[PDB]
Amino acid sequence: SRNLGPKIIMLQRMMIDVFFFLFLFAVWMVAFGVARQGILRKNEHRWEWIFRSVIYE
Amino acid sequence: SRNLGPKIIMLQRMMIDVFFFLFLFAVWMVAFGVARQGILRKNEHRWEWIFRSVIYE
Ligand SMILES: CC(C)CCC[C@@H](C)[C@H]1CC[C@H]2[C@@H]3CC=C4C[C@@H](OC(=O)CCC(=O)O)CC[C@]4(C)[C@H]3CC[C@]12C
Numbered sequence: 778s779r780n781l782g783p784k785i786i787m788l789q790r791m792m793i794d795v796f797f798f799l800f801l802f803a804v805w806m807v808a809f810g811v812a813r814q815g816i817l818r819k820n821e822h823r824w825e826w827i828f829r830s831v832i833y834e
Numbered sequence: 835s836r837n838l839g840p841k842i843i844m845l846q847r848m849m850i851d852v853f854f855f856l857f858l859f860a861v862w863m864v865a866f867g868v869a870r871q872g873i874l875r876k877n878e879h880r881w882e883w884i885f886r887s888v889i890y891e
């Protein structure tokens with residue numbers, strides 16, 4: 778494009794920052810979800826809802 | 835990691851900014867909550883709800 782090409786190519790340099798962001802976010806999600814689910818619920822025997830309440834929410 | 839370690843270490847330098855942000859936020863929260871609670875409610879004799887409507891909201 779001569780106006781969009783450089784900006785599009787720039788995206789290749791943000792991958793490290795995105796990966797760091799995702800790493801921190803995933804760690805926090807896992808910790809908080811496991812803590813809450815264990816705190817305010819009893820044994821769950823449905824696998825889908827474990828990930829639906831630990832990861833998705 | 836050689837890719838995440840520097841960024842993780844950088845977090846130690848943001849504490850002053852975070853503290854300033856929290857200080858301003860807390861001052862504003864206290865002021866606004868006390869003002870509103872006094873304006874639009876009568877005497878409250880339940881301690882939990884004082885902090886639930888002055889700080890939490
Ligand atoms: C709604 C679905 C079922 C049909 C397709 C919807 C259209 C609105 C899409 C299809 C192709 C798209 C276009 C594909 C290519 C371009 C050119 C693109 O860049 C430029 O116009 C100039 C580029 C330059 O300056 O170098 C801007 C968006 C546009 C019009 C896209 C915007 C929206 C379009 C027309």
Ligand SMILES: CC(C)CCC[C@@H](C)[C@H]1CC[C@H]2[C@@H]3CC=C4C[C@@H](OC(=O)CCC(=O)O)CC[C@]4(C)[C@H]3CC[C@]12C
Binds near residue numbers: 803838
């Ligand atoms: C859902 C609960 C009940 C079980 C645990 C969920 C998993 C999805 C968690 C547990 C341990 C986590 C991992 C701990 C360590 C790492 C490596 C970490 O960094 C790298 O992959 C490369 C590091 C580098 O390049 O130096 C990225 C996240 C990952 C896979 C974490 C992402 C998510 C994992 C697999």
